[PDB]
Protein backbone atom coordinates (compact mmCIF):
# COMPACT_ATOMS: atom_id res chain seq x y z
CA UNK A 1 0.00 0.00 0.00
CA UNK A 2 1.09 3.60 -0.42
CA UNK A 3 0.35 6.95 1.19
CA UNK A 4 -1.09 9.80 -0.90
CA UNK A 5 -1.61 13.45 -0.08
CA UNK A 6 -4.84 15.07 1.04
CA UNK A 7 -5.79 18.18 3.03
CA UNK A 8 -8.39 18.51 5.79
CA UNK A 9 -11.65 20.06 4.74
CA UNK A 10 -13.66 19.49 7.95
CA UNK A 11 -13.77 17.03 10.83
CA UNK A 12 -17.10 15.14 10.97
CA UNK A 13 -16.92 12.54 13.76
CA UNK A 14 -14.71 9.79 15.21
CA UNK A 15 -14.45 7.66 12.05
CA UNK A 16 -15.54 10.04 9.22
CA UNK A 17 -13.88 13.24 7.90
CA UNK A 18 -14.07 15.47 4.90
CA UNK A 19 -10.76 15.66 3.05
CA UNK A 20 -9.65 17.04 -0.30
CA UNK A 21 -8.19 14.18 -2.33
CA UNK A 22 -6.82 14.57 -5.88
CA UNK A 23 -8.35 18.04 -5.64
CA UNK A 24 -11.93 16.89 -4.98
CA UNK A 25 -13.80 17.05 -1.63
CA UNK A 26 -14.67 13.59 -0.29
CA UNK A 27 -16.03 12.17 2.91
CA UNK A 28 -13.70 9.45 4.14
CA UNK A 29 -14.79 6.55 6.38
CA UNK A 30 -11.82 5.02 8.28
CA UNK A 31 -11.20 1.36 7.37
CA UNK A 32 -11.43 -1.44 9.93
CA UNK A 33 -12.84 0.63 12.83
CA UNK A 34 -16.08 1.73 14.44
CA UNK A 35 -16.36 4.77 16.64
CA UNK A 36 -19.59 5.41 18.60
CA UNK A 37 -21.96 7.94 17.01
CA UNK A 38 -21.78 11.43 18.48
CA UNK A 39 -24.95 10.86 20.51
CA UNK A 40 -23.59 7.63 22.07
CA UNK A 41 -21.30 7.03 25.02
CA UNK A 42 -17.68 7.94 24.03
CA UNK A 43 -18.93 9.45 20.75
CA UNK A 44 -18.11 13.00 21.76
CA UNK A 45 -14.63 11.86 22.89
CA UNK A 46 -14.04 9.92 19.68
CA UNK A 47 -15.05 12.99 17.63
CA UNK A 48 -12.68 15.30 19.57
CA UNK A 49 -9.82 12.84 19.38
CA UNK A 50 -9.94 12.53 15.55
CA UNK A 51 -10.63 16.29 15.11
CA UNK A 52 -7.58 17.25 17.21
CA UNK A 53 -5.38 14.67 15.53
CA UNK A 54 -6.21 15.70 11.95
CA UNK A 55 -6.46 19.47 12.59
CA UNK A 56 -3.14 19.61 14.41
CA UNK A 57 -1.34 17.71 11.68
CA UNK A 58 0.97 19.37 9.32
CA UNK A 59 0.53 16.60 6.86
CA UNK A 60 -2.54 14.47 6.14
CA UNK A 61 -2.17 11.30 3.99
CA UNK A 62 -4.66 8.76 2.72
CA UNK A 63 -3.84 5.13 2.15
CA UNK A 64 -6.24 2.96 0.20
CA UNK A 65 -6.21 -0.81 0.76
CA UNK A 66 -6.25 -3.43 -2.02
CA UNK A 67 -10.03 -3.62 -2.55
CA UNK A 68 -12.92 -1.24 -2.93
CA UNK A 69 -11.99 2.44 -2.51
CA UNK A 70 -15.48 3.84 -1.96
CA UNK A 71 -18.40 2.39 -0.03
CA UNK A 72 -22.10 2.17 -1.02
CA UNK A 73 -22.63 5.71 0.34
CA UNK A 74 -19.89 7.24 -1.84
CA UNK A 75 -17.47 7.60 1.15
CA UNK A 76 -13.80 6.87 0.39
CA UNK A 77 -12.44 3.93 2.42
CA UNK A 78 -8.87 4.52 3.65
CA UNK A 79 -6.28 4.52 6.35
CA UNK A 80 -5.73 8.14 7.29
CA UNK A 81 -2.35 9.38 8.66
CA UNK A 82 -1.60 12.57 10.56
CA UNK A 83 2.08 13.43 10.44
CA UNK A 84 2.78 9.79 9.76
CA UNK A 85 0.59 8.39 12.61
CA UNK A 86 -2.42 6.31 11.61
CA UNK A 87 -5.66 7.80 12.96
CA UNK A 88 -7.40 4.39 12.59
CA UNK A 89 -4.83 2.74 14.91
CA UNK A 90 -4.64 5.65 17.32
CA UNK A 91 -8.44 5.58 17.97
CA UNK A 92 -8.31 1.82 18.59
CA UNK A 93 -5.23 2.12 20.83
CA UNK A 94 -7.08 4.67 22.97
CA UNK A 95 -10.21 2.51 23.30
CA UNK A 96 -12.16 5.14 21.31
CA UNK A 97 -12.91 2.69 18.51
CA UNK A 98 -13.50 -1.05 18.08
CA UNK A 99 -11.92 -3.05 15.28
CA UNK A 100 -14.94 -3.66 13.03
CA UNK A 101 -16.13 -4.00 9.47
CA UNK A 102 -13.23 -6.19 8.47
CA UNK A 103 -14.05 -7.26 4.91
CA UNK A 104 -11.61 -9.55 3.13
CA UNK A 105 -9.50 -7.79 0.54
CA UNK A 106 -9.51 -4.48 2.40
CA UNK A 107 -7.92 -5.75 5.58
CA UNK A 108 -4.17 -5.14 5.34
CA UNK A 109 -3.82 -3.45 8.76
CA UNK A 110 -6.23 -5.83 10.54
CA UNK A 111 -3.64 -7.47 12.77
CA UNK A 112 -1.92 -4.12 13.69
CA UNK A 113 -5.27 -2.71 14.80
CA UNK A 114 -6.20 -5.87 16.74
CA UNK A 115 -2.91 -5.67 18.63
CA UNK A 116 -3.83 -2.09 19.57
CA UNK A 117 -7.35 -3.11 20.67
CA UNK A 118 -5.90 -5.85 22.85
CA UNK A 119 -3.71 -3.25 24.58
CA UNK A 120 -6.60 -0.73 25.07
CA UNK A 121 -8.62 -3.63 26.47
CA UNK A 122 -5.81 -4.60 28.87
CA UNK A 123 -5.60 -1.03 30.07
CA UNK A 124 -9.42 -0.92 30.31
CA UNK A 125 -9.49 2.34 28.33
CA UNK A 126 -12.60 4.31 27.57
CA UNK A 127 -14.94 1.92 25.77
CA UNK A 128 -13.28 -0.96 27.61
CA UNK A 129 -13.68 0.71 31.06
C1 LIG B 1 -16.10 0.80 7.32
C2 LIG B 1 -16.99 0.33 6.19
C3 LIG B 1 -18.33 0.57 6.30
N1 LIG B 1 -19.20 0.19 5.28
C4 LIG B 1 -20.63 0.37 5.39
C5 LIG B 1 -21.13 -0.83 6.27
C6 LIG B 1 -22.36 -0.29 6.95
O1 LIG B 1 -23.53 -0.46 6.10
P1 LIG B 1 -24.91 -0.05 6.83
O2 LIG B 1 -25.05 1.54 6.67
O3 LIG B 1 -25.98 -0.68 6.03
O4 LIG B 1 -25.13 -0.36 8.39
C7 LIG B 1 -21.93 1.18 7.22
C8 LIG B 1 -21.29 1.43 8.58
O5 LIG B 1 -20.74 2.75 8.49
P2 LIG B 1 -20.90 3.61 9.86
O6 LIG B 1 -20.25 2.87 11.09
O7 LIG B 1 -20.20 4.89 9.49
O8 LIG B 1 -22.43 3.83 9.92
O9 LIG B 1 -20.94 1.47 6.26
C9 LIG B 1 -18.66 -0.51 4.22
O10 LIG B 1 -19.41 -0.89 3.31
N2 LIG B 1 -17.34 -0.69 4.07
C10 LIG B 1 -16.49 -0.33 5.06
O11 LIG B 1 -15.34 -0.63 4.96
CA1 LIG C 1 -19.64 4.73 13.55
Amino acid sequence: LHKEPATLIKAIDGDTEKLMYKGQPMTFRLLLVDTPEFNEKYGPEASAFTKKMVENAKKIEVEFDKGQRTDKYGRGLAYIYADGKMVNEALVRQGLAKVAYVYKGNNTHEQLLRKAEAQAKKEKLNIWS
Side-chain angles (χ1 to χ4, degrees), residues 51-68:
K51 172 157 145 46
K52 199 193 144 178
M53 191 166 168
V54 303
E55 274 184 351
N56 285 8
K58 160 204 342 232
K59 180 173 157 201
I60 297 304
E61 288 175 286
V62 298
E63 178 182 66
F64 293 104
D65 212 315
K66 233 106 191 191
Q68 97 164 159

Side-chain angles (χ1 to χ4, degrees), residues 13 15-16 29-35 37 68 70-73 75 77 100-103 106:
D13 71 352
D15 61 17
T16 61
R29 172 64 165 79
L30 294 184
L31 285 174
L32 299 188
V33 304
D34 194 33
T35 54
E37 304 292 327
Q68 97 164 159
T70 62
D71 68 13
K72 64 203 199 183
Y73 299 111
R75 300 184 298 183
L77 297 177
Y101 293 110
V102 182
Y103 300 97
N106 264 347

Side-chain angles (χ1 to χ4, degrees), residues 88-120:
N88 316 45
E89 196 195 357
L91 288 154
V92 169
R93 178 59 183 87
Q94 291 304 309
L96 287 172
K98 285 184 195 185
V99 178
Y101 293 110
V102 182
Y103 300 97
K104 48 163 141 191
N106 264 347
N107 64 348
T108 303
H109 297 315
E110 186 187 5
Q111 289 312 128
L112 181 70
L113 311 175
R114 288 200 187 279
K115 173 50 161 302
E117 192 174 88
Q119 197 59 46

Side-chain angles (χ1 to χ4, degrees), residues 81-92:
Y81 294 80
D83 288 331
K85 290 199 22 130
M86 198 205 301
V87 179
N88 316 45
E89 196 195 357
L91 288 154
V92 169

Side-chain angles (χ1 to χ4, degrees), residues 5-6 19-25:
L19 302 180
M20 191 184 282
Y21 168 69
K22 275 170 176 173
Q24 299 313 324

